[PDB]
Design a binder for these strands. Structure first.
Length: 1119
RNA sequence: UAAAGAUGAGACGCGUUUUAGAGCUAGAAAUAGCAAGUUAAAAUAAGGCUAGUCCGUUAUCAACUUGAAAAAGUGGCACCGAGUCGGUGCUU
DNA sequence: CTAATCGCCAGCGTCTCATCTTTATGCGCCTA
DNA sequence: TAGGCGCATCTGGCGATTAG
């Protein structure tokens, strides 16, 4: 048949050959279908398939989580409104209506332009009293008097929208800033309780607090400098545990059980405090100090006369910026003229022009402003502020990101406690408002769907809508967490219907250690062949050794077993090594927590113990572990539960319950574990037992073992090439008669990657035969091959290639993969070389660009300012493009050809027209079901439905003199022709590019140097070839003469310095989008084909995925 | 073995757009001189219904047939030749 | 006057949690 | 003998411009 096929899968291109008759490229005759009277097309069987790269789901997941966050925030505001409505409907009119209707202009607005009150005098009075919301915040904290419901609503709404980073567990007191002056008190309390009175430096407390804050990695040296005398505990990390937190875990001075390794500020810190206090101070004020340092890091209030230090700090920022601005305004206008307009009265330049109503930022403003005040007198008073980057500060910036929800929590609680006397309506909802602050959906629950979504898994205990106040009542948290863990854990491959066991469970880990110890054998001095341990001595080992010491087999069970066999020592062991692998760590952990070993060794309650390990391996949070352990609280409450809940396990296994102890053999009545315990004189392991001869374990395995195989990870770009290659082979088998190919060769898209499993799909499809001994034979081979062979063959036999000329190189790589792969097989190098030279020279290579309907975002994301243009598209249907707009430049999906009548001019007499029209992504579905209505609504009339042709991206057109174009946009054309550059220029041009690098160490340097020196006329001949090809198919005469002028002048550096730049003229000639390029000093701008009108009267081509079957439509006949 | 990604789940801080923050003085304006600037509301793919505190940017893509559809179909041969596929003979 | 040319512009940084797969090691083994 | 299994160790859009 000589149907040896080949392939070269890639990220953006898949190549293919079809046969290797005489290990040569074949040629074959095909006919076409369509209006053209041609049928004698004799093609090659070589081709390449180019396509866009496959994108990952990371960006899509990011936008999905973003819109989920947005709608949850809107629902939080809606809950806020639901609480406030019953009194705001009586205190105000259309309040939330006018807050929702703030986008619209005064013509579209229905109530009032002013969003807060609805009056102008009250608005300006409110703004002059409070220039910033934080002034109102401080007023509602320190007022001690009743205020307006609208203002307190704005305060709570501000905190609910802008909430906090949610990273600190526990609580922080808002008034814990005077305790920052009690750091000396804390250290002196530690001194008086200690028995050496350690010394300290007074007045350095705040200085050392900011010094250690700046010295994040030099905190050791900072603590050594701040604490004199004894500093071993400070260098160990005790003082950093007091101030910053116990980031390390090393022991400083012990004194609390084994070591002081408890968490500083977390959910487990309170539980770990009981264990530290059991072996018992300084921690009580150390926690307050840890609050104080983080408070003073971000909230700088020197004297505590307020309970709202965030608002106090923002007021200080406002006052500093105002005072220093009115200093600079009076200084610059009196010292430096001719700049005042540029800094103060500009908008489109950096400085204070762009810092307020322009697009400039803080860094650009600082960089602009430094030379301005670097040269005047009375300076450096602001350069010192500039060096600390707190010059002319604004409040709402990036720096207020570390703001704690604990501070907003206690701050809102402070306002509610202050104001609850005056308003009894919202006193009763204080706890649920506080919940609305603190409500988060846990990460193990997921979206609150009903199974229609492909992402949610949560199980509802009760059927009701989910609110923050009924979350624990409606949602069953334990089953939801179990499903969350189980939906992403793999199944066991032997039987895919059951879940696998945890890595550190009793039965599982016991089977691992039993599988090792059954393989552990003993050798005799009499009989040379060692016999397996077996007997009841397998039982005797584990209870006497493994149930007593953690990791008994670390060069230690050896001497322990030698003492056991001290009279049996004529018989010696033949174990794997001195240190074994498995252990009874879970056994000994729960042993050291438990006080009863009888039931544990009784090996009967392992059903209970499996659930015991299951909860600790599955779940994380202490309370939600606790509720599941409450079933055994009838006996495990007092002396177990205090220590067992602190233990947690991490790790999942690969075997399952049903396989390991469910399936037993009827001839013996014993399961696999009992087979390992009492297998007889011959002990078979897991692999030997499951696939043993005359064993019924294989029949039950095959009973349950009998497009979805593509999910093999390896990025979501490679899978596109895999499926395209499968489709290409599937469609090629149809073309080449109906016979099955000889063999398949596939390329790299390490050998352990997705390619090995990708070959198996080709096996499963091609070697499809009867299971009984017909699929046992392999009619066809599928081969994957290492790239070093084809690269060395490339360097050996002079088939070089630069990637910048043409896309024929993809198909030639696929061809060379097939040739060398088949060449290794036929003899178990040849006469091929002249034939392969001929093959790579050939001008007809079936290059197709995969026509694809575009999907993705509708348009650009930036919201542009309003303008009098039709390019802008309304952001929402409610709004208007020219009024607000901002969304322009949409991405089209595909084009269509249409012929119809249309009216134009003042005559209103109708003319006929034939057009190409592009459809956008946003309107595609509207086109599909309403084409006849959609094009008539868009402007045509009396349209003929049967003449409409759909045209995706990269639709191919053919014009006069063999000129082809591809259509990417609606009306922008891309180059469709390829430069069939002969091999004489390529062989020269590679060696010219390699004039000084990799020209051949074994005296191959000199010959290749003189070859390109003596063939320098090839430079001129390539310029003529590019020129002739460009005048015929490219039509780039202006850029061509520009290039010719640059080529003629740049000849003083004529050896290979042309050649690297000559590679850049091929950027003009390649297929696809035109690209700008540089040629020596001159830079050549791209020329863009807008004239889509010429393809209306051209010939349209439809091509198969391999390109061998074509369909041509003559658009002149349709006109 | 640490990194490395690849998947889902829960949260922050900016940015943009429109709107609200009464501009004054002398001049026909031409404009000129002058105060002033730090904040807030709404939206954050149009939208879809199953009306969920859910879904909407990943992956799927030649025409001509029969299928409402999953799909199943669909168009001879060999030598001699190369400028983006031609010549000739067998052949039915 | 309506169609080619030229220059410019494209939404962003941090946290927390889980699973699985890979650069590279064996031990006990097995099927084709 | 290869292949598997269990456990660990940038390129289309758009406004301003020129111009055939």
């Amino acid at each position: 048949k000589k149907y040896s096929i080949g392939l070269d899968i890639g990220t953006n291109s898949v190549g293919w050959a079809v046969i290797t008759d005489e290990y040569k490229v074949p040629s074959k005759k095909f006919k076409v279908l369509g209006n053209t009277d041609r049928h004698s097309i004799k093609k090659n069987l070589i081709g390449a398939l180019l396509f866009d790269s496959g994108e990952t789901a990371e960006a899509t997941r990011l936008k999905r989580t973003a819109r989920r966050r947005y709608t949850r925030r809107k629902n939080r505001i809606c809950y806020l409104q639901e609480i406030f409505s019953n009194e705001m409907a009586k205190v105000d009119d259309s309040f939330f209506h006018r807050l929702e209707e703030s986008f619209l202009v005064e013509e579209d607005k229905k109530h009032e332009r002013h969003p807060i009150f609805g009056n102008i005098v009250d608005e300006v009075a409110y703004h002059e009293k409070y220039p910033t919301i934080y002034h109102l915040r401080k007023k509602l904290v320190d007022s001690t008097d009743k205020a307006d419901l609208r203002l307190i609503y704005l305060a709570l709404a501000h905190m609910i929208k802008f909430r906090g980073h949610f990273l600190i567990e526990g609580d922080l007191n808002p008034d814990n800033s005077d305790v920052d002056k009690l750091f000396i008190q804390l250290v002196q309390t530690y001194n008086q309780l200690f028995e050496e009175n350690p010394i300290n430096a007074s007045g350095v407390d705040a200085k050392a607090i900011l010094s250690a804050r700046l010295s994040k990695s030099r905190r050791l040296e900072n603590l050594i400098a701040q604490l004199p005398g004894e500093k071993k505990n400070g260098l160990f990390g005790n003082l950093i545990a007091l101030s910053l937190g116990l980031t390390p875990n090393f022991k400083s001075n012990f004194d609390l059980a084994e070591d002081a390794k408890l968490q500083l500020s977390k959910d487990t810190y309170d539980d770990d405090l009981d264990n530290l206090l059991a072996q018992i101070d300084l921690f009580l004020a150390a926690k307050n100090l840890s609050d104080a340092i983080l408070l003073s890091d971000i909230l700088r209030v020197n004297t505590e006369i307020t309970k709202a230090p965030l608002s106090a700090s923002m007021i200080k920022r406002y006052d500093e910026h105002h005072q220093d601005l009115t200093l600079l305004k009076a200084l610059v206008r009196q010292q430096l003229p001719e700049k005042y307009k540029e800094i103060f009265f500009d908008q489109s330049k950096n400085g204070y022009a762009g810092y307020i109503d322009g697009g400039a930022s803080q860094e650009e403003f600082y960089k602009f402003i430094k030379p301005i005040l670097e040269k005047m007198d009375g300076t450096e008073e602001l350069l010192v502020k500039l060096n600390r980057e707190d010059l002319l500060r604004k409040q709402r910036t990036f720096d207020n990101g570390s703001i704690p929800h604990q501070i907003h929590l206690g701050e809102l609680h402070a306002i509610l406690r202050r104001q609850e006397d005056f308003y009894p309506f919202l006193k009763d909802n204080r706890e649920k408002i506080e919940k609305i602050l603190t409500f988060r959906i846990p990460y193990y629950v997921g979206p609150l769907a009903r199974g229609n979504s492909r992402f949610a898994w949560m199980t509802r205990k009760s059927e009701e809508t989910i609110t923050p106040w009924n979350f624990e009542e409606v949602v069953d948290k334990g089953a939801s967490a179990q499903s969350f863990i189980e939906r992403m854990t793999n199944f066991d491959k032997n039987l895919p219907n059951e879940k696998v066991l945890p890595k550190h469970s009793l039965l599982y880990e016991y089977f691992t250690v039993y599988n090792e110890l059954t393989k552990v054998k003993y050798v005799t001095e009499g009989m040379r062949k060692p016999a397996f341990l077996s007997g009841e001595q397998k039982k005797a080992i584990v209870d006497l050794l493994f149930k007593t010491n953690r990791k008994v087999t670390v060069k230690q069970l050896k001497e322990d077993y030698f003492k056991k066999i001290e009279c049996f020592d004529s018989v010696e062991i033949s174990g794997v090594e001195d240190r074994f692998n498995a252990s009874l760590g879970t056994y000994h952990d729960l042993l050291k927590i438990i006080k009863d070993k009888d039931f544990l060794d009784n090996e009967e309650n392992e059903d209970i113990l499996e659930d015991i390990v299951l909860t600790l391996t599955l779940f994380e949070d202490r309370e939600m572990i606790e509720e599941r352990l409450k079933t055994y609280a009838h006996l495990f409450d007092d002396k177990v539960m205090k220590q067992l809940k602190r233990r947690r396990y991490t790790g999942w296994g690969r075997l399952s319950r049903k396989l390991i102890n469910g399936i037993r053999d009827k001839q013996s009545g014993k399961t696999i574990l009992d087979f390992l315990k009492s297998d007889g004189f011959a002990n078979r392991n897991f692999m030997q037992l499951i696939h043993d001869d005359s064993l019924t374990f294989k029949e039950d395995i095959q009973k349950a073992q009998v497009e979805h195989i593509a999910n093999l990870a390896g990025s979501p770009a490679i899978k596109k090439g895999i499926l395209q290659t499968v489709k290409v082979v599937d469609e090629l088998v149809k073309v080449m008669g109906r016979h099955k190919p000889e063999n398949i060769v596939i390329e790299m898209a390490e050998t352990r990657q997705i390619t090995k499993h990708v070959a198996q799909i080709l096996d499963s499809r091609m070697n499809t035969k009867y299971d009984e001994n017909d699929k046992l034979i392999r009619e066809v081979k599928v081969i994957t091959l290492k790239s070093k062979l084809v690269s060395d063959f490339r360097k050996d036999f002079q088939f070089y290639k630069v990637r910048e000329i043409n896309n024929y190189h993809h198909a030639h790589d696929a061809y060379l993969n097939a040739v060398v792969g088949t060449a290794l097989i036929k003899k178990y190098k040849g006469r091929d070389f002249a034939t392969v030279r001929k093959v790579l020279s050939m001008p007809q290579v079936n290059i197709v660009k995969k026509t694809e309907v575009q999907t993705g975002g509708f348009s650009k994301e930036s919201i542009l300012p309003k303008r009098n243009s039709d390019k802008l598209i309304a952001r929402k249907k409610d709004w208007d493009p020219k009024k607000y707009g901002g969304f322009d430049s949409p991405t089209v999906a595909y084009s269509v050809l249409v012929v119809a009548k249309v009216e134009k001019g003042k005559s209103k007499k109708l003319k006929s027209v034939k057009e190409l029209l592009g459809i956008t992504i946003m309107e595609r579905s509207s086109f599909e079901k309403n084409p006849i209505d959609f094009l008539e609504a868009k402007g045509y009339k009396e349209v003929k439905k049967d003449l409409i042709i759909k045209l995706p991206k990269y639709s191919l057109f053919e014009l006069e003199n063999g000129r082809k174009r591809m259509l990417a946009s609606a009306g922008e054309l891309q180059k469709g022709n390829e430069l069939a550059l002969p091999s004489k220029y390529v062989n020269f041009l590679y060696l010219a590019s390699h004039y000084e690098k990799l020209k051949g160490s074994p005296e191959d340097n000199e010959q290749k140097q003189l070859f390109v020196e003596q063939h320098k006329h090839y430079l001129d001949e390539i310029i003529e070839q590019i020129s002739e090809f460009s005048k015929r198919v490219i039509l780039a005469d202006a850029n061509l003469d520009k290039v010719l002028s640059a080529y003629n002048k740049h000849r003083d550096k004529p050896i290979r310095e042309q050649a690297e730049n000559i590679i850049h003229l091929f950027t003009l000639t390649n297929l696809g989008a035109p690209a700008a390029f540089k040629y020596f000093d001159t830079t050549i701008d791209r020329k863009r084909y807008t004239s889509t009108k010429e393809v209306l009267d051209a010939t349209l081509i439809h091509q198969s995925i391999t390109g061998l079957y074509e369909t041509r439509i003559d658009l002149s006949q349709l006109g």
